[PDB]
Each structure stands twice: as C-alpha cells, then as structure tokens.
Design an enzyme around this catalytic site. Structure first.
Site, short mmCIF file in Angstrom:
data_model
loop_
_atom_site.label_atom_id
_atom_site.label_comp_id
_atom_site.label_asym_id
_atom_site.label_seq_id
_atom_site.Cartn_x
_atom_site.Cartn_y
_atom_site.Cartn_z
N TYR A 50 26.94 42.21 34.59
CA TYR A 50 27.73 41.60 33.52
C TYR A 50 26.78 41.37 32.37
O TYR A 50 26.07 40.37 32.35
CB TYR A 50 28.39 40.30 33.99
CG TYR A 50 29.20 39.54 32.96
CD1 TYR A 50 30.05 40.18 32.08
CD2 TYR A 50 29.09 38.17 32.83
CE1 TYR A 50 30.77 39.49 31.10
CE2 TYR A 50 29.80 37.47 31.88
CZ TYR A 50 30.64 38.12 31.02
OH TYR A 50 31.34 37.41 30.06
N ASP A 68 30.36 45.60 33.24
CA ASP A 68 30.70 45.33 31.86
C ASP A 68 29.41 45.44 31.09
O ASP A 68 28.56 44.54 31.12
CB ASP A 68 31.34 43.97 31.69
CG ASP A 68 31.68 43.63 30.26
OD1 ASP A 68 31.31 44.40 29.30
OD2 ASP A 68 32.35 42.57 30.05
N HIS A 97 40.30 42.42 30.86
CA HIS A 97 39.87 43.77 31.12
C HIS A 97 40.75 44.35 32.22
O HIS A 97 41.30 43.58 33.04
CB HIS A 97 38.42 43.87 31.62
CG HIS A 97 37.39 43.33 30.69
ND1 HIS A 97 36.29 44.09 30.34
CD2 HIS A 97 37.19 42.11 30.16
CE1 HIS A 97 35.49 43.37 29.58
NE2 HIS A 97 36.01 42.17 29.43
MG LIG Z 1 35.78 36.94 29.91
#
Ligand SMILES: [Mg+2]
Length: 314
Positions: free
Chosen positions: A140, A181, A280
């Site tokens: 992340y 991500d 997402h």
């Molecule tokens: Mg978020």
C-alpha cells in the site's frame, strides 16, 4: 492458481462479513490493502477467517490507519512470511534485503512502520513441473500531501526501497509478484482524458517507467501484457460526486510479475469492476502454476497473536 489484490478502504467499512467477501473473490491468495486494522483494535473477525491463514502488517503510528493483509487458502499456506520491506520488524522470514546503504536505519524504520507491506513466500510447480519459489509482495504505497512536503519524499523513498527488495529477492532465484495500490498511474490510457501533452516528468511515473519492462525493467504490468490497448480500465474512483458512475477514475492497482513468470505461468490478468464495497475495485490474475502448501503456518500468521489465543487458553 488465482490471486487477487484489492484496496478495500477498510475491512470493516465494507459492511459485509469478511468470510463472505473473501469467498466471493474466488482466489487462492487474496491481498488486501488499507485494511485499517491496527493491533490495538483486537479485531479478531477481520484478521482470522474460517478457511484462510492470514498475514497482516499493522501500522504502528496511528490507530485504524493503513495496513495490509494477505489471506491464503490451505492450498497456498506459505513457507515463509515477513512484514515490511527492510527487515527491521522481522524464524520463518523471507530475507534477501538488497543493498540499503543509501538509507539510515531510522529511515528504514520509518518506511516500514506504517503497515504498508507484507511478504509471503510460496512453493509452486512450474510448467516443467519443477519446484520454484514465488514471493508475493503486497504493498500500500504512500501518498504525497501538499500540506506535508516530507511525504512526497517518503513516497519516492518507499518506491526505491520496494525496488531494492523485490530485485534482491528475484536475484536469489525463483519468481516475484508485486501487487497492490502503487498510487501512480503509468500511461495516458490509465487515466481519464485529457492527458498532459510533461506527463513523464512525474517522479513516481519516472520510477515506474524504469521499474517496468515492455513486452529495461525486470517486471511486467500483467494487466497490460494481456490487455495492452483496453480503454477505461480503471480501478479507483473518488467516493464523492458520482465518480464511479461517470467513470471519473484511474488505474493505480497492479499485479506486477517478473518477466519469466508472466510469460510462462500467467493465463490472464483482469480488473473486477463488478465488486463493490470500496472506492477501489479488485484486480485478479489467473496462473497455470500449482502451489505446494507448507505443513505449518509461519510465525507471522495472525492465529498466533496472543490476543486471539481463545477462551480455552484463558
Ligand atoms: Mg482509502
């Protein structure tokens, strides 16, 4: 073998039981980003799910912030698992750190203390039925913040650490997937129109350009290996102002694999825009290699956390 990556914008915030969500994604390894689970919350239902063995990295700097988790079915129990990219929060680890001479130790701690990476290592049988290692790096990545200028530097240093670690594991042999991500879109096709006519000037995009190869970098963007020209293939839309319906979005979630893995073992890599519950949507890869489960979960597994030992131990 199937693997999913999803920035879930908080496990609890989906307002669905996690077993139902994970089963619905129909994959052997499920990598979640921004779990918003920290250890102070004692959130056993988000960490321990029937049918899976899981591996979390918890933020140590703020409650309910950041966090990544990898959930494995019994078929893919990892031989090793480790939090972070640098080793500072590390039996049963992955190793192969690479040369971090350019980073102070205190910087390594800072880059690893926000719950942004978890690594799991899996034995697999390849297309010649030889056993190899596959390391899954679930990330992340941070975001720049105009009112906190140091966070742009943090983000770029995180990218450099991620590259260092992933290439060092790859140099040791076997295969590497980086998923999650990345918080940078790569090419104009990856973003809603219109596009900058200095698009490459962005330092995160410069980083990606050299990290990825084109079917000089050692990793391929698997989605584009299989769908090189697909338009509007976004993974992220802001929560406000109807963006997901108007497709006001960007593709910032990836499944990256080393060249040989993608060319020889992948069948497809797709977006799952039908899956709701986050800002997402997931991405999913389909692979022809077959996993060999470890006989025991490595020590990072959530089932070993003392807070979750159960009433019989109490
Ligand atoms: Mg978020």
């Amino acid at each position: 073998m199937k693997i999913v990556s999803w920035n879930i914008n908080g496990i609890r915030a989906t307002r669905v039981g996690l077993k139902e969500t994970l089963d619905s994604l129909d994959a052997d390894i499920i990598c979640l980003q921004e779990t918003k689970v920290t250890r102070d919350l004692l959130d056993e239902p988000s960490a321990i799910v029937e049918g899976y063995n899981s591996y979390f990295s918890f933020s140590r700097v703020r409650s309910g912030y950041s966090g990544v988790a990898t959930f494995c079915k019994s078929s893919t129990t990892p031989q090793a698992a480790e939090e972070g990219l640098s080793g500072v929060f590390c039996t049963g680890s992955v190793g192969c750190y690479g040369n971090t001479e350019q980073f102070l130790e205190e910087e390594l701690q800072s880059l690893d203390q926000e719950g942004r990476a978890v690594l799991t290592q899996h034995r697999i049988l390849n297309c010649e039925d030889k056993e190899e290692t596959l390391t899954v790096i679930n990330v992340y990545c941070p975001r720049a913040d105009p009112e906190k200028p140091e966070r742009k530097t943090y983000k770029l240093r995180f990218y450099h650490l991620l590259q260092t670690r992933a290439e060092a594991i790859l140099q040791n042999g076997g295969h590497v997937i980086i998923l999650g991500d990345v918080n940078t879109s790569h090419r104009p096709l990856d973003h809603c129109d219109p596009t900058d006519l200095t698009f490459e000037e962005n330092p995160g995009r410069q980083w990606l350009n050299q990290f990825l190869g084109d079917p000089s970098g050692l990793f391929y963007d698997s989605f584009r290996y299989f769908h090189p020209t697909q338009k509007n293939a976004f993974t992220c839309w802001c929560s406000a102002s109807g963006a997901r319906q108007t497709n006001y979005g960007t593709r910032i979630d990836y499944i990256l694999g080393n060249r040989e893995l993608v060319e020889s073992e992948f069948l497809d890599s797709v977006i799952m825009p039908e899956v709701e519950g986050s800002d997402h949507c997931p991405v999913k890869a389909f692979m022809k290699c077959q996993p060999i489960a470890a006989n025991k979960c490595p020590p990072l597994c959530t089932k070993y956390l003392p807070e979750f030992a159960g009433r019989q131990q109490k």
